């Protein structure tokens with residue numbers, strides 16, 4: 001038994017499991033299946049410890065998984081480790097993924113920026129909303145700070161750049177990742193088995 | 199998209215990943231690759247949260263993985279949760295797996311029983327060695343308790359039913375699991391890719 005060739009086969013299989021788990025995670029996110037998302041996220045994270053070198057494609061895959069993980073924890077130890085909120089961490093990942101900065105990318109970025117403040121207001125932590133505002137900002141900045149200062153959670157600006165609109169735009173992006181990974185090895189072989197039964 | 203057929207494909211893939219990870223775990227255990235074992239163990243454990251119903255074969259696979267996990271932690275929160283040591287938990291799993299109780303099964307069982315006491319003596323916790331002895335026992339019982347009472351860690355009985363002899367016998371069992379799972383779908387498809395390159 002050649003230990004080097006066995007290690008190479010384990011790395012090939014980790015690559016297949018990563019794409020499979022990213023697909024599962026995209027679907028659980030799109031479907032709103034929170035417990036399934038949490039289980040798939042735990043598996044995806046553990047699996048990538050079997051890879052010490054990633055291709056550009058695999059890097060994009062792990063960063064999409066980390067991005068969805070932070071969005072899913074948006075309203076929820078992480079505070080003490082990163083010193084920022086989950087939506088601010090989603091913003092950092094989003095602004096660094098190797099992807100085109102098209103109209104959809106900008107729309108999602110702006111929705112996350114405003115929702116990073118609004119989720120703190122929704123939770124009743126207005127001091128934290130101001131600290132998130134200072135870290136992000138740090139067209140209308142003095143007006144946004146006034147809305148936070150005035151606890152005006154349901155101001156028309158917040159109603160337009162809403163949590164639902166952020167989730168709808170992220171889900172449309174998730175649909176593209178889902179279609180682009182639809183033909184990956186593991187899910188395709190698994191659907192072939194299910195189709196034969198049936 | 200039929201959500202039921204997608205869930206069925208995810209369950210088929212979890213089954214393939216479980217066999218693949220059990221093979222990887224058997225190899226890391228046999229090779230003494232501790233960090234690789236810990237990584238594969240974390241992945242195997244996370245993956246099986248994607249299965250709510252297991253066949254008899256899958257149950258045997260998860261119990262072999264849990265058994266190796268406890269053996270690997272033999273000398274190392276678990277104390278407060280199970281109220282026993284890792285080797286005593288390995289013994290409980292070993293005595294309940296759906297497998298033949300042949301000569302090798304008995305040899306491993308007896309080696310774990312004595313090593314559950316001896317690892318406590320090796321760590322200098324002689325009070326714990328006596329508590330392990332009382333829980334397991336609880337041909338010569340008064341003699342074994344005297345050896346523990348006398349801190350006679352290197353008594354010929356302990357030298358014969360040694361940690362090395364326990365690991366050699368468990369590794370011979372691991373070789374059978376490894377050969378029996380050698381042709382499972384994921385590792386075989388992965389070795390085929392590596393062979394094509396080479």
Ligand SMILES: COc1ccc2sc(N)nc2c1
Nearest residue numbers: 041044045048062065066069
């Ligand atoms: C590949 O999936 C994931 C999902 C969540 C996380 S958090 C982290 N640091 N790495 C990952 C990877």
Ligand SMILES: COc1ccc2sc(N)nc2c1
Nearest residue numbers: 139155156157158159160161
């Ligand atoms: C940046 O564009 C917008 C969109 C919606 C609203 S509601 C409001 N008060 N200001 C704006 C600005």
Ligand SMILES: COc1ccc2sc(N)nc2c1
Nearest residue numbers: 239242243246260263264267
């Ligand atoms: C399938 O692999 C494993 C490995 C370790 C553990 S601990 C636990 N409760 N379940 C498992 C499963």
Ligand SMILES: COc1ccc2sc(N)nc2c1
Nearest residue numbers: 337353354355356357358359
């Ligand atoms: C159960 O068989 C054995 C094997 C080795 C030894 S060394 C000793 N003192 N007693 C025994 C008993």
